[PDB]
Write a protein that holds these residues in place. Sequence first.
Motif, mmCIF file in Angstrom:
data_model
loop_
_atom_site.group_PDB
_atom_site.id
_atom_site.type_symbol
_atom_site.label_atom_id
_atom_site.label_comp_id
_atom_site.label_asym_id
_atom_site.label_seq_id
_atom_site.Cartn_x
_atom_site.Cartn_y
_atom_site.Cartn_z
ATOM 1 N N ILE A 122 0.832 -1.201 0.000
ATOM 2 C CA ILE A 122 0.000 0.000 0.000
ATOM 3 C C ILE A 122 0.866 1.250 0.000
ATOM 4 O O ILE A 122 1.191 1.805 1.054
ATOM 5 N N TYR A 123 1.231 1.701 -1.198
ATOM 6 C CA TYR A 123 1.919 2.971 -1.389
ATOM 7 C C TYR A 123 1.085 4.159 -0.921
ATOM 8 O O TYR A 123 -0.140 4.174 -1.061
ATOM 9 N N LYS A 124 1.766 5.161 -0.364
ATOM 10 C CA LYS A 124 1.167 6.394 0.138
ATOM 11 C C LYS A 124 1.712 7.580 -0.656
ATOM 12 O O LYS A 124 2.881 7.582 -1.046
ATOM 13 N N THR A 125 0.871 8.590 -0.900
ATOM 14 C CA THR A 125 1.368 9.860 -1.422
ATOM 15 C C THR A 125 2.145 10.625 -0.345
ATOM 16 O O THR A 125 1.834 10.521 0.844
ATOM 17 N N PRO A 126 3.154 11.405 -0.733
ATOM 18 C CA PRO A 126 3.693 12.444 0.168
ATOM 19 C C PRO A 126 2.654 13.492 0.524
ATOM 20 O O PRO A 126 1.606 13.597 -0.130
ATOM 21 N N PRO A 127 2.906 14.284 1.572
ATOM 22 C CA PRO A 127 2.005 15.410 1.863
ATOM 23 C C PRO A 127 2.186 16.581 0.911
ATOM 24 O O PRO A 127 1.197 17.178 0.471
ATOM 25 N N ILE A 128 3.432 16.918 0.571
ATOM 26 C CA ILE A 128 3.739 17.916 -0.453
ATOM 27 C C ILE A 128 3.447 17.341 -1.836
ATOM 28 O O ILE A 128 4.210 16.526 -2.364
ATOM 29 N N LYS A 129 2.324 17.769 -2.420
ATOM 30 C CA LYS A 129 1.829 17.297 -3.711
ATOM 31 C C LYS A 129 2.542 17.933 -4.906
ATOM 32 O O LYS A 129 1.881 18.361 -5.860
ATOM 33 N N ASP A 130 3.875 18.015 -4.877
ATOM 34 C CA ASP A 130 4.644 18.721 -5.914
ATOM 35 C C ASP A 130 4.793 17.883 -7.190
ATOM 36 O O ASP A 130 5.879 17.434 -7.563
ATOM 37 N N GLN A 174 -8.807 15.809 -7.306
ATOM 38 C CA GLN A 174 -10.084 15.128 -7.481
ATOM 39 C C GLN A 174 -9.986 13.605 -7.463
ATOM 40 O O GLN A 174 -11.012 12.943 -7.279
ATOM 41 N N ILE A 175 -8.801 13.032 -7.653
ATOM 42 C CA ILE A 175 -8.666 11.590 -7.843
ATOM 43 C C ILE A 175 -7.868 10.934 -6.719
ATOM 44 O O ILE A 175 -8.043 9.741 -6.447
ATOM 45 N N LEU A 176 -6.995 11.687 -6.056
ATOM 46 C CA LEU A 176 -6.444 11.242 -4.779
ATOM 47 C C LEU A 176 -7.483 11.289 -3.654
ATOM 48 O O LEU A 176 -8.489 11.994 -3.752
ATOM 49 N N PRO A 177 -7.258 10.532 -2.576
ATOM 50 C CA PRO A 177 -8.179 10.559 -1.430
ATOM 51 C C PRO A 177 -8.361 11.936 -0.815
ATOM 52 O O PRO A 177 -7.431 12.742 -0.751
ATOM 53 N N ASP A 178 -9.581 12.194 -0.350
ATOM 54 C CA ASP A 178 -9.837 13.343 0.515
ATOM 55 C C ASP A 178 -9.264 13.101 1.908
ATOM 56 O O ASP A 178 -9.542 12.062 2.515
ATOM 57 N N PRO A 179 -8.459 14.023 2.447
ATOM 58 C CA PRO A 179 -7.907 13.824 3.794
ATOM 59 C C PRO A 179 -8.906 14.080 4.909
ATOM 60 O O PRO A 179 -8.644 13.687 6.055
ATOM 61 N N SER A 180 -10.030 14.729 4.614
ATOM 62 C CA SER A 180 -11.055 15.066 5.595
ATOM 63 C C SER A 180 -12.057 13.946 5.869
ATOM 64 O O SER A 180 -12.939 14.134 6.713
ATOM 65 N N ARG A 222 -12.308 7.818 0.249
ATOM 66 C CA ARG A 222 -12.608 7.976 -1.170
ATOM 67 C C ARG A 222 -12.003 9.264 -1.733
ATOM 68 O O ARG A 222 -11.767 10.234 -1.011
ATOM 69 N N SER A 223 -11.754 9.260 -3.045
ATOM 70 C CA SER A 223 -11.535 10.485 -3.809
ATOM 71 C C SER A 223 -12.851 11.216 -4.071
ATOM 72 O O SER A 223 -13.931 10.768 -3.690
ATOM 73 N N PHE A 224 -12.757 12.370 -4.734
ATOM 74 C CA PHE A 224 -13.953 13.107 -5.138
ATOM 75 C C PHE A 224 -14.698 12.430 -6.281
ATOM 76 O O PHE A 224 -15.930 12.347 -6.258
ATOM 77 N N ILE A 225 -13.978 11.943 -7.288
ATOM 78 C CA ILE A 225 -14.623 11.261 -8.410
ATOM 79 C C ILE A 225 -15.192 9.907 -7.993
ATOM 80 O O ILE A 225 -16.247 9.492 -8.487
ATOM 81 N N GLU A 226 -14.521 9.195 -7.089
ATOM 82 C CA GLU A 226 -15.119 7.997 -6.500
ATOM 83 C C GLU A 226 -16.382 8.329 -5.715
ATOM 84 O O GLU A 226 -17.411 7.657 -5.854
ATOM 85 N N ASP A 227 -16.319 9.366 -4.879
ATOM 86 C CA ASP A 227 -17.484 9.782 -4.107
ATOM 87 C C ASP A 227 -18.626 10.217 -5.014
ATOM 88 O O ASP A 227 -19.796 9.935 -4.735
ATOM 89 N N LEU A 228 -18.304 10.901 -6.103
ATOM 90 C CA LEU A 228 -19.300 11.221 -7.119
ATOM 91 C C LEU A 228 -19.938 9.964 -7.704
ATOM 92 O O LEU A 228 -21.166 9.857 -7.780
ATOM 93 N N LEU A 229 -19.120 9.001 -8.126
ATOM 94 C CA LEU A 229 -19.641 7.762 -8.708
ATOM 95 C C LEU A 229 -20.525 6.990 -7.737
ATOM 96 O O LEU A 229 -21.645 6.598 -8.081
ATOM 97 N N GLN A 255 -8.451 1.775 -0.516
ATOM 98 C CA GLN A 255 -7.035 1.644 -0.185
ATOM 99 C C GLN A 255 -6.224 1.114 -1.360
ATOM 100 O O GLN A 255 -5.182 1.680 -1.709
ATOM 101 N N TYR A 256 -6.675 0.029 -1.987
ATOM 102 C CA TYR A 256 -6.002 -0.457 -3.188
ATOM 103 C C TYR A 256 -5.997 0.579 -4.307
ATOM 104 O O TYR A 256 -4.962 0.816 -4.941
ATOM 105 N N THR A 257 -7.139 1.209 -4.567
ATOM 106 C CA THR A 257 -7.200 2.222 -5.615
ATOM 107 C C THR A 257 -6.274 3.394 -5.317
ATOM 108 O O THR A 257 -5.600 3.904 -6.217
ATOM 109 N N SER A 258 -6.232 3.833 -4.063
ATOM 110 C CA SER A 258 -5.241 4.813 -3.632
ATOM 111 C C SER A 258 -3.806 4.319 -3.815
ATOM 112 O O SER A 258 -2.937 5.083 -4.247
ATOM 113 N N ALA A 259 -3.532 3.059 -3.490
ATOM 114 C CA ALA A 259 -2.178 2.531 -3.650
ATOM 115 C C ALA A 259 -1.740 2.464 -5.110
ATOM 116 O O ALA A 259 -0.610 2.840 -5.438
#
Lengths: 49, 211, 114, 168, 146
Positions: free
Chosen positions: D52-60, D68-74, D79-86, D109-113
Motif C-alpha cells: 500500500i503505497y502512500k502519497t507524500p504530503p507535499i503534492k509537488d 479530485q482523484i487522490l483521497p480526501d484527507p477530511s 474515497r476520492s472526489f470522483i469515487e465519491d461522485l460515482l 485503499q487499493y485504488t489509492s495505492a
Amino acid sequence: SECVLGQSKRVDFCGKGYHLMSFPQSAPHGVVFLHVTYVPAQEKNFTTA
Amino acid sequence: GKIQDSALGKLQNVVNQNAQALNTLVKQLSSNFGAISSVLNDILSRLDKVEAEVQIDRLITGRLQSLQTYVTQQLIRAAEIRASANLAATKMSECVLGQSKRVDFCGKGYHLMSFPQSAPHGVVFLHVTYVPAQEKNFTTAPAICHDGKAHFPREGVFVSNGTHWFVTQRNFYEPQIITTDNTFVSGNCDVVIGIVNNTVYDPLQPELDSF
Amino acid sequence: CSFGGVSVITPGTNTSNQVAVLYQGVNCTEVPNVFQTRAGCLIGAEHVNNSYECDIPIGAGICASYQQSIIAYTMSLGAENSVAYSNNSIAIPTNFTISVTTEILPVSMTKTSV
Amino acid sequence: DCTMYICGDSTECSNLLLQYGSFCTQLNRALTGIAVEQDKNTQEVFAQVKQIYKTPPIKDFGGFNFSQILPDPSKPSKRSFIEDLLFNKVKFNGLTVLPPLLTDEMIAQYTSALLAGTITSGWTFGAGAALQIPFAMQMAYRFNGIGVTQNVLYENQKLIANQFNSAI
Amino acid sequence: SETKCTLKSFTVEKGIYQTSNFRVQPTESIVRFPNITNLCPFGEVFNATRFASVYAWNRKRISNCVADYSVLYNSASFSTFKCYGVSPTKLNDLCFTNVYADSFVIRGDEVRQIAPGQTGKIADYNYKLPDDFTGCVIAWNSNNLD
Ligand SMILES: *[C@@H]1O[C@H](CO[C@@H]2O[C@@H](C)[C@@H](O)[C@@H](O)[C@@H]2O)[C@@H](O[C@@H]2O[C@H](CO)[C@@H](O)[C@H](O)[C@H]2NC(C)=O)[C@H](O)[C@H]1NC(C)=O
Ligand SMILES: *[C@@H]1O[C@H](CO)[C@@H](O[C@@H]2O[C@H](CO)[C@@H](O)[C@H](O)[C@H]2NC(C)=O)[C@H](O)[C@H]1NC(C)=O
Ligand SMILES: *[C@@H]1O[C@H](CO)[C@@H](O[C@@H]2O[C@H](CO)[C@@H](O)[C@H](O)[C@H]2NC(C)=O)[C@H](O)[C@H]1NC(C)=O
Ligand SMILES: *[C@@H]1O[C@H](CO)[C@@H](O[C@@H]2O[C@H](CO)[C@@H](O)[C@H](O)[C@H]2NC(C)=O)[C@H](O)[C@H]1NC(C)=O
Ligand SMILES: *[C@@H]1O[C@H](CO)[C@@H](O[C@@H]2O[C@H](CO)[C@@H](O)[C@H](O)[C@H]2NC(C)=O)[C@H](O)[C@H]1NC(C)=O
Ligand SMILES: *[C@@H]1O[C@H](CO)[C@@H](O[C@@H]2O[C@H](CO)[C@@H](O)[C@H](O)[C@H]2NC(C)=O)[C@H](O)[C@H]1NC(C)=O
Ligand SMILES: *[C@@H]1O[C@H](CO)[C@@H](O[C@@H]2O[C@H](CO)[C@@H](O)[C@H](O)[C@H]2NC(C)=O)[C@H](O)[C@H]1NC(C)=O
Ligand SMILES: *[C@@H]1O[C@H](CO)[C@@H](O)[C@H](O)[C@H]1NC(C)=O
Ligand SMILES: *[C@@H]1O[C@H](CO)[C@@H](O)[C@H](O)[C@H]1NC(C)=O
Ligand SMILES: *[C@@H]1O[C@H](CO)[C@@H](O)[C@H](O)[C@H]1NC(C)=O
Ligand SMILES: *[C@@H]1O[C@H](CO)[C@@H](O)[C@H](O)[C@H]1NC(C)=O
C-alpha cells in the motif's frame, strides 16, 4: 496492468488517442479508468518526400 | 529449480467440477421424483401399463430435468474453458512465440521468454522475467543547459552522484559521460523548468585539437 | 423469525479438529469466543488485532486462520510505503533478478457423451 | 436456501422435496461458486499492488492537480472526489445477500495505492520495485513512448498541466 | 460432523462451508378465532319436513354461527360425504366467510352426477357445481320418507 501499471501501445485499449497514463477509481461493483491520452491537434499540410 | 517447489487449484477445479457434475447426474437416478420407485424395473414388475405410464412419466420428467441441468451446466462451463483456451493461445503466441510489451501479461516484471509445458487438460507457462533489484537514489534533472542550449537525454535519464552528472539507461545503472552522442538539443535553456548546468563533452573537440 | 446460513470455518482435518461457526446475518443476541462480524455472529474464533493476510474468507474484511486456536482478523492489504518522492530524485536499479513464474491455464475439459 | 424458498417452515413440503433429490444442493452449490468468484474477480483487479503505497504530503507533481482523484484527507472512508461522485450517481423468502470480502474502504485503499504508485513511481511499482521518478520526467518518458520527443513535454509543461487539470 | 456429512467426505480441506440453515423454531402455538357465541346449526337444513325439488334448490346462508363439522361427518346416515378443496378431518380448523347450504332430492344412482365438472341432467338443467367448488356434498337415502 496495461493502462495503469504500464503504458499501452495497443490502439484504443486505453482510450482514444495515444495512451499516456491511466488512473483507477473505485465504483459500486466496478472500476472506472480515467485514461489520459495524447490526441494530436491543429493539422498543417506539408509537401513530403 | 524453484518450480519444483511451486496455481494448480484453478486447473483442478475443472477436473473436480466435471467429476461432481457426473456424480450428481448419476445420484439423481436414485431420486424417486414422486414415483413409487427409483428403479424402472420395479415399476414394470409391480404395475401394468395403464398405471406404470404415470409412474414412468414422473421418472422421465425428473431424469430429463436432471440431464438438461447437466447439459446447461456443461455448456456454460465450456464457454469458460474456451475463454481460458483463447487466453492460453494468445499467451502461446505473445509470450512464447514472441516477447510481450504488455505489462503483467507474461508474469510479473519485464518479460523476456516463456516456455510452454503440458499439463492435464491445461498448459503451464514458465514466464522468464527481468525484475529490477537493488535500488539506489540519485539526484536527477530533465535537461542540462550548456552554452545557453538545452540538452536532453537521447535514451535515458540524467543522474548525479552529487559531484558529477551522467546519462544512464532507465532500467539499469550504467553511468556514461554526458556527450553530444548521448544527448540531443532542443531550444534555448530558458523555457525548460528544473534545469541544471553541466559541461557536455564533444568527441570532436579533443580529437580535432589533437591534430 | 430469524434464519441464516450456518457456515463452518475449518482448518484442514489433517491440521486440527477445531472449527468455528459463522451464523450468517444474525446478531449474537439471537444465536442461543462470541464475535459479531459484519457478516454475522462468529462462534469459536478469537478476535485478534494483528491484520494478517487472508487465509479463510469470512466477509466484510474479516478472515480466519489457525495459530493452537482459530483466530479471526481484519485482513491486511500490504505493508505501507511512502516512496520518498521528490521533484529532483530518481531511483535506478543497480542489479536485477531473473524470476521464473508459473502460470497455469485450463485448455480443455473431458469430452462426455450421454 | 432452496428449502426456505420452496416451502418455508413445513416439514411435509420439505420431505417431498427430498424425493426430487440433489436439486436443492446443486443450486446452493452453484450460487456458492458464483459468490466466491466475485471475491476472486475483485481481488484480481485491485490486488495487483502488493504494497500500500502512500502519497507524500507535499503534492509537488509538476503542476498536475490530482486533488479530485487522490483521497480526501477530511473523510474516514478515504474515497476520492470522483469515487465519491460515482458512488452517489450510480426478504424473508430464503433469499440472502452476502457482504463482499473486500469492503469499499479496502477497494479505496487499493485504488489509492495503485494511484500513488502511478504518480510517484510510474510503471515501476507494477513491474517490481516502486522506483520513484519526478512526475514531469515520467510524463516526458510517456511522451517518448508515443513517438513524441521528450522535449515537447518540458517546453510545454504548463500547457500540458493546464489541459490535464481542465480535463479532470 | 455436519461439514463432513455435507461434503460426503470423511476429511475436509481448509475452508468455509455452508453446512446448514438454522431457524429459531416456534416456542408455542397461538389460536385465535372470532368470539361468536351462536351455534345455529345445519339442523333445519338436514331435517326439514320436505326438501326442495332439484330444479329450485333451497339455499340457506349459515353465517355468524359456530359449526362443528365432526358431528356431521360422524353421522352414519351420510352414504356420500365427498368433499372438494377441503378435507373433513380439518374442517374444524377452518373458518369461512359464508357457508351456503343448498338442499334438494334426486334419484339414488343420479347422485354421482352432482360432482363438480360432471355433466348430465342435474348438472346440465337443474344444479351445477362450479369446477373450483370448495365444499362438501352430503347425500343419504330417503325412500324411507320422501
Ligand atoms: C530514496 O531515498 C530514501 C531516503 O533514504 C535516505 O536518503 C538517501 C539519499 C540516503 O542518504 C539514505 O541512506 C537515507 O536513508 C530511501 O529510504 C531509505 O531506505 C533504506 C533502505 O534502502 C532504509 O534503511 C532507510 O531507513 C530509508 N530512509 C528513510 C529516511 O526513510 C528510499 O528507499 C529511496 N527510494 C527508493 C524507491 O529506493
Ligand atoms: C562521482 O563519479 C565520478 C566518476 O566516477 C567520481 O570522480 C572520480 O573520483 C576518483 C576518486 O574517488 C578520481 O580518482 C577520479 O579521477 C574521478 N574521475 C573524474 C572523471 O573526475 C566522483 O568521485 C564521484 N563522486 C561521488 C560522491 O561518488
Ligand atoms: C547556468 O548557466 C547560465 C549561463 O552561463 C547562467 O546564466 C548567467 O548567469 C550569470 C550570473 O547570474 C549572469 O551574469 C548571466 O547574464 C547569465 N546568462 C544568461 C544568458 O542568463 C545561469 O545562472 C546558470 N545557472 C546555474 C543554476 O548555475
Ligand atoms: C547482483 O546481485 C547478485 C545476487 O544477489 C549478486 O550475486 C551474488 O554475490 C554474492 C557476493 O556478493 C555471492 O556470494 C553470490 O553467490 C552471488 N549470487 C549469484 C547467483 O551469483 C551480485 O554480486 C550483485 N552484483 C552487483 C554488481 O551488485
Ligand atoms: C487543485 O484544484 C482544487 C480544486 O479547484 C483547488 O482547491 C480549491 O481551492 C480554492 C482556493 O483555495 C478553495 O476555495 C476550494 O474550496 C478548493 N477546493 C477543494 C475541493 O478543496 C486546489 O487549490 C488546486 N491545487 C492547487 C495546488 O492549487
Ligand atoms: C495550442 O493549443 C492550446 C489550446 O488552444 C493553446 O493554449 C492556450 O494558449 C493561450 C495563449 O495563446 C492561453 O491563454 C491559454 O491558457 C492556453 N490554454 C490552456 C489550456 O492553457 C496554445 O496556445 C496552442 N499553441 C500553439 C503553439 O499553437
Ligand atoms: C337430525 O335429527 C337427528 C335425529 O333427531 C339428529 O341425530 C343426532 O345426530 C348426532 C350426530 O350424528 C348424533 O351424535 C346423535 O346421537 C343423534 N341423535 C339421535 C337421537 O339419533 C341430528 O343431530 C339432526 N341433524 C343435525 C344436523 O343436527
Ligand atoms: C522542488 O521543490 C522545491 C520546494 O519544495 C522548490 O523550491 C524547487 O524549486 C523544486 N525543484 C524542482 C527541480 O522542481
Ligand atoms: C497429513 O498429516 C501428515 C502428518 O501427520 C502430513 O505428513 C501429510 O502431508 C498430511 N496430508 C495432507 C493431505 O495434508
Ligand atoms: C445487528 O448488529 C449490527 C452491527 O453489527 C447493527 O448495525 C444492527 O442494528 C443490529 N441489529 C439488526 C437487527 O441488524
Ligand atoms: C483488539 O483491539 C481492541 C481495541 O480496538 C482491544 O480492546 C482488544 O483487546 C484487542 N484484542 C486483543 C486480543 O488484544
